[PDB]
Structure 1
Amino acid sequence: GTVTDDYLANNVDYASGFKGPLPMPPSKHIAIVACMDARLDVYRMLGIKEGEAHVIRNAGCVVTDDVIRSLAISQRLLGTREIILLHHTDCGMLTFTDDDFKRAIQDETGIRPTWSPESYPDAVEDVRQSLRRIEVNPFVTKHTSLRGFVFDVATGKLNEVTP
């Protein structure tokens, strides 16, 4: 069997004790943007319960156009008004560079991706940068709170970053 079979079996247990359905709009009107990193259980990290929060995740917790899209939909159609950005210490994007990453891919495949791999060398700096990307975007404006943090993978603590 595979891990997917394993996780599917776990879903049976989850299903048996499931309470639902809940309304679609986030009850706590908040959106989290975070990293796909395996060590971030975003829900337990923030004490989130089902139905409270949108959670968006990608490699590097990068504010791409997909995140902008997802946030726009979140705010305009589902009434979220707060945004938490999560980066973290020891994160994957610190270990590599775009130019090297695309070069390796072109070696194997013969082509370079059209998209940017969006690596960055410093978590704290990039939270600031990430905050600036949301601030300057004309479609994500319905928030009354926008704050960014670095999750410490060694201690579990969230440390705020000043824009």
Structure 2
Amino acid sequence: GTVTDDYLANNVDYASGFKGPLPMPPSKHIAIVACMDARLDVYRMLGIKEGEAHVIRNAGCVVTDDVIRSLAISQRLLGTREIILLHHTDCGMLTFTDDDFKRAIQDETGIRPTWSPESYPDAVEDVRQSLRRIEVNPFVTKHTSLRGFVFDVATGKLNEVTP
């Protein structure tokens, strides 16, 4: 028995009380960019219901090109117009540097990844940096609201960052 097996069993119960289908476009025309961190239940954190919001998550809530791609699709094809960025306290990206992470992988595998690990030293600062990445990008321009926050993993509160 794996965790996957357990989660599939959970899904049978989820399915038993499921109502659907809902429409594809987010009913609230909003996209959340968040971290993959195990301590972030994005839906409960923001009181989101099914069908309302796109949720995009990766290591460190980094505005990579994959995030730009997902946001471009979200706005242009599926009509979203708000963006929430969520970093958080005690994030894994503050605990290593890119050069160290790459060197370690190179030692084990013989090669260095071409991608940047995208670590950063300070979360508040990187929210500003991430907001700027979105502002400067010519493909994510349909939003009427772009706001960035740091989630406190000890209190559950969101604290806004000024760009």
The match for 1:86 is: 86
1:142 is displaced (CA, Å) by 0.1
Q: Deviations over 1:101-135 (max 9, x none)?
A: 00000000000000000000000000000000000
Q: Deviations over 1:16-75 (max 9, x none)?
A: 000100000000000000000000000000000000000000000000000000000000
1:150 is displaced (CA, Å) by 0.1
Using the size of structure 2 for normalisation, the TM-score is: 1.00
Aligned counterparts, 1:6-17, within 5 A: 6-17=6-17
Q: Quick one: percent identity of the two aligned structures?
A: 100
Q: Deviations over 1:58-104 (max 9, x none)?
A: 00000000000000000000000000000000000000000000000
CA distance in 1, matches of 2:151, 2:75: 24
CA distance in 2, matches of 1:19, 1:45: 22
The match for 1:4 is: 4
CA distance in 2, matches of 1:94, 1:49: 31
Aligned counterparts, 1:1-163, within 5 A: 1-163=1-163
Structure 2, unpaired ranges of 5+? none
1:12 is displaced (CA, Å) by 0.2
CA distance in 2, matches of 1:106, 1:129: 28
Moved over 4 A (4+): none
Using the size of structure 1 for normalisation, the TM-score is: 1.00
CA distance in 2, matches of 1:5, 1:90: 30
Structure 1, unpaired ranges of 5+? none
SS of alignment partner, residue 77 of structure 2: helix
Q: Size of the alignment, in residue pairs?
A: 163
CA distance in 2, matches of 1:31, 1:138: 17
CA distance in 1, matches of 2:122, 2:53: 27
SS of alignment partner, residue 28 of structure 1: coil
CA distance in 2, matches of 1:6, 1:123: 34
